[PDB]
Coordinates of C-alpha atoms in Angstrom, one line a residue:
Chain A
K30 CA 13.9 -17.9 -0.6
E31 CA 11.9 -16.0 -3.2
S32 CA 11.4 -17.7 -6.5
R33 CA 11.8 -15.6 -9.6
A34 CA 8.2 -16.5 -10.5
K35 CA 7.0 -15.1 -7.2
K36 CA 9.2 -12.0 -7.3
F37 CA 7.7 -11.3 -10.8
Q38 CA 4.3 -11.7 -9.2
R39 CA 5.0 -9.4 -6.3
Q40 CA 6.7 -6.8 -8.5
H41 CA 4.5 -6.7 -11.5
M42 CA 1.1 -8.3 -11.1
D43 CA -1.9 -6.4 -10.0
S44 CA -4.6 -8.5 -11.6
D45 CA -7.6 -6.9 -10.0
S46 CA -6.8 -3.2 -10.4
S47 CA -7.7 -0.1 -12.3
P48 CA -5.4 2.8 -11.0
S49 CA -6.1 6.4 -11.7
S50 CA -3.5 8.6 -13.5
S51 CA -1.3 10.3 -10.8
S52 CA -3.5 9.1 -8.0
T53 CA -1.3 7.7 -5.2
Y54 CA -1.8 4.2 -6.5
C55 CA 1.9 3.8 -7.2
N56 CA 3.0 5.3 -3.9
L57 CA 1.1 2.8 -1.9
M58 CA 1.7 -0.3 -4.2
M59 CA 5.4 0.2 -4.4
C60 CA 5.3 0.5 -0.7
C61 CA 3.0 -2.5 -0.1
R62 CA 4.7 -4.7 -2.6
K63 CA 8.0 -3.9 -0.9
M64 CA 9.8 -2.0 -3.5
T65 CA 10.6 0.9 -1.2
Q66 CA 12.7 -0.7 1.6
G67 CA 16.3 0.5 1.9
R68 CA 16.1 2.2 -1.5
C69 CA 13.2 3.4 -3.6
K70 CA 12.9 1.4 -6.8
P71 CA 13.2 4.0 -9.7
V72 CA 10.7 2.6 -12.1
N73 CA 8.4 -0.4 -12.0
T74 CA 5.5 -1.8 -14.0
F75 CA 2.2 -3.3 -12.9
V76 CA -0.1 -5.5 -15.1
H77 CA -3.9 -5.5 -14.6
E78 CA -4.6 -8.8 -16.4
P79 CA -5.2 -12.2 -15.1
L80 CA -2.2 -14.1 -14.0
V81 CA -2.7 -16.9 -16.5
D82 CA -3.3 -14.5 -19.3
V83 CA 0.0 -12.9 -18.3
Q84 CA 1.6 -16.3 -18.0
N85 CA 0.5 -17.3 -21.5
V86 CA 2.7 -14.4 -23.0
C87 CA 5.4 -17.1 -22.6
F88 CA 3.9 -19.0 -25.5
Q89 CA 3.5 -15.9 -27.7
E90 CA 5.6 -13.8 -30.0
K91 CA 9.4 -14.4 -29.7
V92 CA 11.6 -11.3 -29.6
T93 CA 14.7 -10.1 -28.1
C94 CA 14.9 -8.6 -24.5
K95 CA 15.9 -4.9 -24.5
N96 CA 19.5 -5.8 -23.9
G97 CA 19.5 -7.2 -27.5
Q98 CA 20.6 -10.7 -26.4
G99 CA 18.0 -12.5 -24.4
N100 CA 14.9 -14.3 -25.6
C101 CA 11.8 -12.6 -24.6
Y102 CA 8.2 -12.7 -25.5
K103 CA 5.9 -10.0 -26.6
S104 CA 2.2 -10.4 -25.8
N105 CA 0.0 -10.7 -28.8
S106 CA -2.3 -8.0 -27.6
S107 CA -2.1 -4.8 -25.6
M108 CA -2.8 -5.1 -21.9
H109 CA -3.8 -2.6 -19.1
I110 CA -0.8 -1.5 -17.1
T111 CA 0.6 1.2 -14.9
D112 CA 4.0 2.7 -14.9
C113 CA 5.4 3.9 -11.6
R114 CA 8.3 6.4 -11.7
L115 CA 10.1 7.8 -8.7
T116 CA 9.8 11.6 -8.2
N117 CA 12.9 13.8 -8.1
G118 CA 12.0 15.3 -4.7
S119 CA 11.9 11.8 -3.2
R120 CA 14.7 11.1 -0.8
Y121 CA 14.7 7.7 0.7
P122 CA 12.9 6.8 2.9
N123 CA 10.4 9.3 1.4
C124 CA 9.5 7.5 -1.8
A125 CA 7.0 9.2 -4.1
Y126 CA 5.7 8.2 -7.5
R127 CA 4.2 9.4 -10.6
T128 CA 1.3 6.9 -11.5
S129 CA 0.8 6.3 -15.3
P130 CA -2.0 4.0 -16.6
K131 CA -1.8 2.9 -20.2
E132 CA -2.7 0.3 -22.7
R133 CA 0.3 -1.8 -24.2
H134 CA 1.9 -5.0 -25.2
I135 CA 4.3 -6.3 -22.6
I136 CA 7.6 -8.1 -23.2
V137 CA 8.8 -10.6 -20.6
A138 CA 11.6 -13.2 -20.1
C139 CA 10.2 -16.7 -19.3
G140 CA 11.7 -19.7 -17.6
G141 CA 11.8 -22.5 -15.2
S142 CA 9.3 -25.3 -15.2
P143 CA 6.6 -24.9 -15.3
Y144 CA 7.9 -22.2 -17.9
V145 CA 6.6 -18.9 -16.6
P146 CA 7.4 -15.1 -16.7
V147 CA 10.5 -14.3 -14.6
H148 CA 11.3 -10.8 -15.6
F149 CA 9.3 -7.9 -16.9
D150 CA 11.4 -6.4 -19.7
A151 CA 9.4 -3.6 -21.3
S152 CA 6.3 -2.1 -22.8
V153 CA 5.0 -1.3 -26.3
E154 CA 2.6 0.7 -28.6
Chain B
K250 CA 13.0 -2.2 18.0
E251 CA 9.8 -0.3 17.3
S252 CA 8.9 2.3 19.8
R253 CA 5.2 2.7 20.7
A254 CA 5.2 6.2 19.3
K255 CA 6.4 5.0 16.0
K256 CA 4.0 2.1 15.9
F257 CA 1.2 4.5 16.5
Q258 CA 2.5 6.8 13.8
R259 CA 2.7 3.9 11.3
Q260 CA -0.6 2.5 12.3
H261 CA -2.7 5.5 12.6
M262 CA -1.3 8.7 11.1
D263 CA -1.9 9.9 7.5
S264 CA -2.2 13.6 7.6
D265 CA -1.8 14.1 3.9
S266 CA -4.7 12.0 2.6
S267 CA -8.4 12.2 2.2
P268 CA -9.6 8.7 1.4
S269 CA -12.9 8.3 -0.3
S270 CA -15.7 6.0 0.6
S271 CA -14.9 2.4 -0.3
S272 CA -12.1 3.1 -2.7
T273 CA -9.1 0.8 -2.2
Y274 CA -7.3 3.2 0.2
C275 CA -7.7 0.9 3.1
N276 CA -6.5 -2.1 1.2
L277 CA -3.3 -0.5 0.3
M278 CA -2.7 1.5 3.5
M279 CA -3.2 -1.5 5.7
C280 CA -0.7 -3.4 3.5
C281 CA 1.8 -0.7 3.1
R282 CA 1.7 0.3 6.8
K283 CA 2.2 -3.4 7.5
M284 CA -0.9 -4.4 9.2
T285 CA -1.5 -7.3 6.9
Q286 CA 1.6 -9.5 7.6
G287 CA 0.8 -13.0 8.9
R288 CA -2.8 -12.0 9.9
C289 CA -5.0 -9.3 8.7
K290 CA -5.7 -6.6 11.3
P291 CA -9.6 -6.7 11.8
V292 CA -10.1 -2.9 12.2
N293 CA -7.8 0.1 12.2
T294 CA -8.3 3.8 12.1
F295 CA -6.3 6.4 10.3
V296 CA -6.2 10.1 11.2
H297 CA -5.8 12.8 8.5
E298 CA -4.7 15.7 10.8
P299 CA -1.3 17.0 11.3
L300 CA 0.9 15.0 13.5
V301 CA 1.2 17.8 16.1
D302 CA -2.5 18.4 16.3
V303 CA -2.9 14.7 16.9
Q304 CA -0.1 14.8 19.4
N305 CA -1.7 17.6 21.2
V306 CA -4.7 15.4 22.0
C307 CA -2.5 14.2 24.9
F308 CA -2.9 17.5 26.7
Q309 CA -6.6 17.7 26.2
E310 CA -9.6 16.1 27.8
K311 CA -8.9 13.1 30.1
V312 CA -11.4 10.2 29.8
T313 CA -11.4 6.5 30.7
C314 CA -9.7 4.1 28.3
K315 CA -12.0 1.6 26.6
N316 CA -10.9 -1.5 28.6
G317 CA -7.2 -1.3 29.1
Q318 CA -7.3 1.4 31.7
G319 CA -4.3 3.8 31.5
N320 CA -4.6 7.6 30.5
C321 CA -6.7 8.3 27.5
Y322 CA -7.5 11.7 26.1
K323 CA -10.3 12.9 23.9
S324 CA -9.7 15.4 21.2
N325 CA -11.3 18.8 21.9
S326 CA -12.6 18.9 18.4
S327 CA -13.7 16.4 15.8
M328 CA -11.0 15.3 13.4
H329 CA -11.0 13.7 9.9
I330 CA -10.6 10.0 10.2
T331 CA -11.0 7.0 8.0
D332 CA -12.1 3.7 9.5
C333 CA -10.7 0.5 7.8
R334 CA -12.9 -2.6 8.3
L335 CA -12.2 -6.1 7.2
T336 CA -15.0 -7.2 4.9
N337 CA -16.8 -10.3 6.3
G338 CA -15.6 -12.5 3.4
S339 CA -11.9 -11.5 3.6
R340 CA -9.5 -14.3 3.9
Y341 CA -5.7 -13.8 4.4
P342 CA -3.5 -13.4 2.4
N343 CA -5.5 -10.9 0.4
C344 CA -6.9 -8.8 3.2
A345 CA -9.9 -6.9 1.9
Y346 CA -11.1 -3.9 3.8
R347 CA -14.1 -1.6 3.8
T348 CA -13.0 2.1 3.7
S349 CA -15.1 4.5 5.8
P350 CA -14.2 8.2 6.1
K351 CA -15.9 10.5 8.6
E352 CA -15.4 13.1 11.4
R353 CA -15.2 12.1 15.1
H354 CA -13.4 13.3 18.3
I355 CA -10.6 10.7 18.7
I356 CA -9.5 9.0 22.0
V357 CA -5.8 8.0 22.3
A358 CA -3.8 6.5 25.1
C359 CA -0.7 8.6 25.8
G360 CA 2.6 7.5 27.3
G361 CA 6.3 7.9 27.9
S362 CA 8.1 11.2 27.7
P363 CA 7.5 13.3 25.9
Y364 CA 3.8 12.4 26.5
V365 CA 2.5 11.4 23.1
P366 CA 0.1 9.0 21.6
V367 CA 0.8 5.2 22.0
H368 CA -2.7 3.6 21.2
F369 CA -5.7 4.6 19.2
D370 CA -8.4 3.8 21.7
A371 CA -11.6 4.9 20.2
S372 CA -13.7 7.5 18.4
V373 CA -16.7 9.7 19.4
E374 CA -19.8 11.8 18.4

């Protein structure tokens, strides 16, 4: 089926993009990357960095995933991202999103082999 | 499965937008409206008019369908469209489209009952 490495790619990677604040970027990406079927994903984050650059976060600072238990990694430098958050008026199947670009460090959980990002945990700075 | 009326709605209706010249509108719409699965649709047109006005074209001027003869109607007035064109160097999976907004009278094949649109046939003026 879908490998964690691929699901992380389809849900969080948008290497070649530079989204405008509250444009409809999020409405169309969430749709196009299939995070709006059956239910509307509440929040999601996209990373505008090269795949490899995002994969090398796996060899960077070691920290703890938000749940305070797992091992995660925090990128050594801020990256370009976009936060998508579902609107209140949204009633599945109508899925709308507030689009939020910003510059931050990402935290991810890595695994498998080759050892790569398998879960986007959070943002910082 | 998918009714012709619905396929037409998903493939050609987008009343609430006003795409700008070669932004990424078409790249995301074609994806999100599912015209990029398996093969990249070559060309596709989107109409930014309310559904009903576009439905009303079916009770307007009759004309000959492009090839596939079978009840086409031409809008009485020019509507706001956006033409999405596959760029010559686009290779699947990342379908890359050229976004072209403009005003044309639209031709649509109509069918079933109620008589509504089933195919976007062409554009004029």
